[PDB]
Design a protein around this ligand. Sequence first.
Ligand SMILES: [Zn+2]
Ligand SMILES: [Zn+2]
Ligand SMILES: [Zn+2]
Ligand SMILES: [Zn+2]
Lengths: 124, 212, 81, 332, 836, 36, 41, 65, 90
Amino acid sequence: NRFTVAELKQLVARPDVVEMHDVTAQDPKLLVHLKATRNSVPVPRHWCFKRKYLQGKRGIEKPPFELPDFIKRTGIQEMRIDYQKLHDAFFKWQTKPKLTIHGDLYYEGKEFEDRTPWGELEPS
Amino acid sequence: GHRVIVSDVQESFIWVRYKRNENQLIIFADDTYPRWVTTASLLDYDTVAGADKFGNICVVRLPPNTNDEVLWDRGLLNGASQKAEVIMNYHVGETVLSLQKTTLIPGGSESLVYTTLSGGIGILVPFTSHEDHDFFQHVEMHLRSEHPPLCGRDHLSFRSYYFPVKNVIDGDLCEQFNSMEPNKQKNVSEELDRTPPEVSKKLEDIRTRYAF
Amino acid sequence: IFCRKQAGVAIGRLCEKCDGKCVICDSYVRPCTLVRICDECNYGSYQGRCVICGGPGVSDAYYCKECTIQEKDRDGCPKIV
Amino acid sequence: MFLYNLTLQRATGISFAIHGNFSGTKQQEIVVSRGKILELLRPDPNTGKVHTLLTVEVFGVIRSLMAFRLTGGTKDYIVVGSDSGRIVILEYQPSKNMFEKIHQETFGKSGCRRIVPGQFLAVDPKGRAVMISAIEKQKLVYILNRDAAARLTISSPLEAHKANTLVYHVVGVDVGFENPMFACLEMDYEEADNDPTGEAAANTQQTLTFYELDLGLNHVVRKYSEPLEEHGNFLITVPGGSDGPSGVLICSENYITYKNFGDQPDIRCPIPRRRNDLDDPERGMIFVCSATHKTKSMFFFLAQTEQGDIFKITLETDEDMVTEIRLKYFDT
Amino acid sequence: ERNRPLSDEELDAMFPEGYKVLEQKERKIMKLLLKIKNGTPPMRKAALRQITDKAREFGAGPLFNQILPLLMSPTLEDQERHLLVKVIDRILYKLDDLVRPYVHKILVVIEPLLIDEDYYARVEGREIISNLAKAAGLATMISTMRPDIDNMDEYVRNTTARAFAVVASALGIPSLLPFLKAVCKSKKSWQARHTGIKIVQQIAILMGCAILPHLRSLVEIIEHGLVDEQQKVRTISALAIAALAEAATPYGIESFDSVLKPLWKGIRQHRGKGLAAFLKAIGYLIPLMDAEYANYYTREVMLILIREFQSPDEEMKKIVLKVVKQCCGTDGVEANYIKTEILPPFFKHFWQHRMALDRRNYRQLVDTTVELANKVGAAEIISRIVDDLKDEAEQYRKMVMETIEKIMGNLGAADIDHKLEEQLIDGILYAFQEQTTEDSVMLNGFGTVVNALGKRVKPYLPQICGTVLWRLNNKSAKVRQQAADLISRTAVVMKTCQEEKLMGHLGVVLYEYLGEEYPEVLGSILGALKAIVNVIGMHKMTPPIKDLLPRLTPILKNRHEKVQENCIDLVGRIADRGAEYVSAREWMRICFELLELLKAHKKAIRRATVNTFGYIAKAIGPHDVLATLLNNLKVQERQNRVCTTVAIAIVAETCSPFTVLPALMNEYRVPELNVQNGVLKSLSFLFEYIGEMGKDYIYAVTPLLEDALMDRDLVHRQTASAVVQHMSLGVYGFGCEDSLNHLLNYVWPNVFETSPHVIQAVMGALEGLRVAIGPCRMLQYCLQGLFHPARKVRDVYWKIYNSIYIGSQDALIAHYPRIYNDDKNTYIRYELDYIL
Amino acid sequence: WLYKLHGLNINYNCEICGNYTYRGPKAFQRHFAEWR
Amino acid sequence: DPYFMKNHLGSYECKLCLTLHNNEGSYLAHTQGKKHQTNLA
Amino acid sequence: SKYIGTGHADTTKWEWLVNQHRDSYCSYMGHFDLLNYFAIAENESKARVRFNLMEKMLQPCGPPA
Amino acid sequence: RLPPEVNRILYIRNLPYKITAEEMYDIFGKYGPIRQIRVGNTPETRGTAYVVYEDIFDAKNACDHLSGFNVCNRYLVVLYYNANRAFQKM
RNA sequence: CAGAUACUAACAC
RNA sequence: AAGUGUAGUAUCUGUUCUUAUCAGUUUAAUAUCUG
Ligand SMILES: [Zn+2]
Ligand SMILES: [Zn+2]
Ligand SMILES: [Zn+2]
Ligand SMILES: [Zn+2]
């Protein structure tokens, strides 16, 4: 008694959101509506993959973890004492990394894939 | 200028640019949270203060290098390609139907005045420097534990009612300092490396710069 | 398995071996909210016994700060039974 | 970037107001909730003018207030229901000019939640127990007493939960020194969730239910329940013992009804309407709030309708039985 | 087999070189149970799955005809019986009504287990009979068990009654009450009435406070038995009332009104074990009463109880003491009446050496006398006891010492007069010196009496110190161990200003004892020194701290637990408070010894050791100690490695994480699974410990966590998830949403993980993130999977949603997406769309 | 076993693709964004 | 060998079968084995 | 599972929304300001707004499917 | 009733090199009849020994009590025998 | 489905 | 010569099944199981 994909595609405001498995839901019309909502996050793509998550990430040599530049410039990477510089690294030099926006999930291939502001702090 | 900020009843803030020559209204940014907006104040060319039906204030800001000069297009998360970032969240406790950036006293500093449905009037005021901010943050942290809310609700949880509290210190909690028994004032001021008169002075000094 | 019945006025206790431990998550860090237990758990021969393991009880049991922040202190009697 | 919040003018609206000798002195005071703020008011009976003694930001939602007094005591406690998951008892201290938290009993998770108690709050008129209840399912009963040092002491909660059941309102019933009783306007939604015709939803009757706390057996029994002809919006405790015939007054659309357990007939009186009313004739009328005034000889209720009109309500008795309700228009 | 004699040939082979000698369905169930009793765990699970469905094709008859002989097998292990019981419950559930023709056969096989003293066998027996009483209707249980209510054997009546109490533990009290209301009045046989009354007694014993809403009904079932001509029924009705009263405590007095007058009439009339049962009943009832009743009825008791003190019967002797305890422990009873009427006959009869000769009477009288003191006051009771500290019998001296111990440990010394101190201290000194055996009661009592008197002990201290110093100079290992323990216990009083000088001698004596041949004694030596360094300052202590550290270093290596636990405390105390008095070189040497003690089996030693690595870091700086700890990550032993991760976090807490974090990050670069996991585990503990400070370090560690989350290895992901959770819970209310949101992108893909530890960690991270980034985000992640076609996706998503819902039900109201209206259903929340 | 694993026992049809039969769940899903 | 390799976690991978080896020992066992021969053939 | 409001794989549209609506009306009854908002918008007495919300609790979305 | 790792054979380490047969029997024999004692007498084995009790319950006793045991300037390390560690040098 | 190995839970002794 | 047990994962090794043409049990789909 299910819709065809063809049928469901015409019954909804956003056909592009419809996938092949959607018509097999308990409520496909609710499911597609929910997928269309502002700021909702997709289900992780690998739910239907036979291999377990991240398990195909094999057979590739990767370099060791790249330290952030403020820690790197502390020189401890070469040491393996200067506690003032060690403080300044975290409390002066610490710069925020390239943080990802809401909803942009990770997966195996992702890695290799007057203008003045109000209420700003005064300079020290 | 050419910017238009639209409050949606539920989908919070949408930034629209009017283009004269093309004669077009283009959406160029939106929020990443539902907000049941009741009122809005523009703080600066990139920043909006919002109130919602659920007693919250927020401040949303366009991140730097946001571009306003804009079936193959889908946008991001079923909304606009660029996202405003919530730089402030605070559960006021009462529904706010007005916000206004204004100076309440002559020669005083500018503040964000807000009115509530319950007839309450208050302000949000920017700290000018680290030292001040850090001091009232430490005051708030000590008062949260040493002078807990009367009817047994966690203060941080209350200010984080619908969204986690972000970049607001509750001065209504800080001014509880003056109501405490003197032993507790002594304990808290010792923790602050101050004496109680200096704490009360700092409390009065902020509340006297922006608005009586 | 936690009792999870309505917490009473009775206060939870810890044996020497299980002391410092948060009942819910075994952390030794920042005891915060005093544990309360249901009457049936405090009753008769069970008076003053350890919430975690039923030992003689020498100290007051606490939920840690994290459990307090998460409102895990609210679930009801945490005697493991 | 970084903001500091200050109140300039505190909330002036009132959601709850309660009466007592909060100072313990013979002078009467009013504790009012302004939602986010608790406040104590003294009306000066000489000037006829109201002074704020004390205001406190409570940093939560006050969902209910009651005054109560232990038997033989002279000072009223404030018991607060809130979005905190805990029943809090306060004593006002005149010397320090502050509310002092006497007890804080925790039972649930914070927020204004459907199944966590806090919305309704009812006291034994003799102070011996307090019931705190949610809109759905959970009701908890705390027994109150004093120690050998005359400090207030509180029991473990006794539960009185009922699945699928809405509560419209709860009040304590004045039964004198008999076992404490709470009356609830209840409705069971189970059948309404199970019938796809909608028949059950329309055929569902609100019930008046009397929960007795057995002090000797330390449990709450759902002793009596009866369906109501129309839905009540709230209850009024009628004075009992030697002060009246006890029972309860259900305020409902277009009516006020007196009910008591035992051989008492239901007495029902329609709410009088304004002559030549310009309102829509389809609108029913509810009482929106009430007050009770007691005196050595007699008592009466003031109940206000939606239109602002206050009725003085009085009950006529033969022996223990109420025989009629009498309404007199009082003022608007 | 393990103690079988060994040939020299067996023995010689144990040793390396270089040592000098100085129908078809029945067959199916068989092959199934064989693979539950024996075989591998998946084979047990498969066979249990097969048999529990196949019970529908077997039916109850053939199934229990095979299972009951197997359950009766005389060599069946507790765990193999427990597995057979987990089969029994599940087949009873699967059979339902099909059990009914076989209830009798199943029951008579299990009835002995309801009496068997081994707790496990007896709770398993209660469980399977509860499951039987769910699968069988109550009418079937009654129809099975009704004949044996009148069995001639008391053991059958006893098990029948116990089985009916198990029936009552599932089928409610109201259900069996009418059957009991018939049985207890069944005139034909007193043994039926007796068994009914005994069911109520066993119901009371089993159910405890759950009796109370049915208590009146249960009393009214028994009440006439107290008035009956059958002395057995009078006796056992009183025992049933005692059991109901006991289970009702402290409530329910109004239920017993009907039986009080029958009890009082019986109290005046009866003798022997009959009277003992009535006295037990009244004894359990008096604590329920208000003060006026309590006084009157206590006074009614004493007109008989004081006579019964004369009784030679051990059961009466137990009961009369228990009744004294119950009366005198009841709140309302006048203490003057106790002092004047209870004490003289009680002391005259029971406080004699003869009562010490049996452990049962001993414990009873000790407890009863403590309970008399608990209401009369300490000194009145102690002054009656104290002379017997100087009586000849060791066992009696031990009895009075234990009594004084238990009185003064509860009530304190404030009641005691000066002369009574002299009498106490003289008697205690005699008792402690003139013991032929080492006894803990004497160590306890002496320490307790001293610690309770406190500052008052000042005149006696020179005599006490000389006595314990003398006993510590005795050759005997056990004697010196006893003396050194007493020093450890009494140290709290030695804080008195003059007594530091006396303690100075003890310190230098104990220093010589550091070569103790016996480890057990050495443990007490160290436990004394532990107390001493806690009382006097490091400089104040007579042995130099600088000299002490080298002496304690070999002791640290000592393998014995007693030595190990005590040594690490002493060293740890020195590291924490007296850090200055030692060289960096010595402290660093200690760190290496500590590396070894992370292999200790007891967690208490490991916990203390981890603290010490940290204390040393405060003193000598973090860099050096961190380097040693990072090297220890290479060790294969997880419990050692895990303990080292804790130490790294402690060091980072003590010396700010800015000092420790760069080295930790570097070690992550090291290409070993264990090190990279140790680094992540240290970051988990560190964010747990630092709380608010985490905001300063969140951005630095975010890339490392992102790398671990992206890692193929499950443990890296699991450990990174733990970090996430703790760091999110610590940074709540301090901004930093951006980093937590970014990490949520890495964590969320792991929701489909099936590994129990990894899924628990991911769930824990999500709960933490709900507080930190808000329920709104969590809901946004869960929306698309709630109504996803695959059940697997829905199961996980609803589990996450439920956690958010329980955690933040109120908050979610604002966050729920707009659901458009259906033809027959309205889903739009119109009020929230109102504009003002 | 790999034949059944890769779902090659199924055989989907696409008219827009001139009635080509991909023979695979994954094959089919990829084809919509490919040349035919 | 041109297929045997060390991963960043101290374990070993075979490049010709993407197989994971806890130890250098396991790799050689995988080398004397079905998948492993089929790849070479 | 024991907590009223929790869902699982077989939760229908109707069940979930009835949860949202009953939970919303309880939030409205507790949040005095949100109740204020509705009372002013409807030009209605608070007592009547609460009563109307309690009435709506019984079947907030129309009958089950 | 005792765990699986307990055994009549007690491997000993940190043993003084000068220790005599009589002293060994003295120390170990306190806990009950000694079956035999074997003392390491090569560069690789000196300072170790295996002590064998007749009865397992005596051996548990000795093992519980003698680890950390002070003889001379040393503290003995006493372990129950494990074959697979006993032949580790092979 | 069995064996070998590695690992997790401040798991326990 | 710092051992053993409990609960749970992961990875190599050696096993991983030709079918017509439909139905059913199932699953998101396949596979599995039964005609
Ligand atoms: Zn314990
Ligand atoms: Zn915890
Ligand atoms: Zn195609
Ligand atoms: Zn290969």
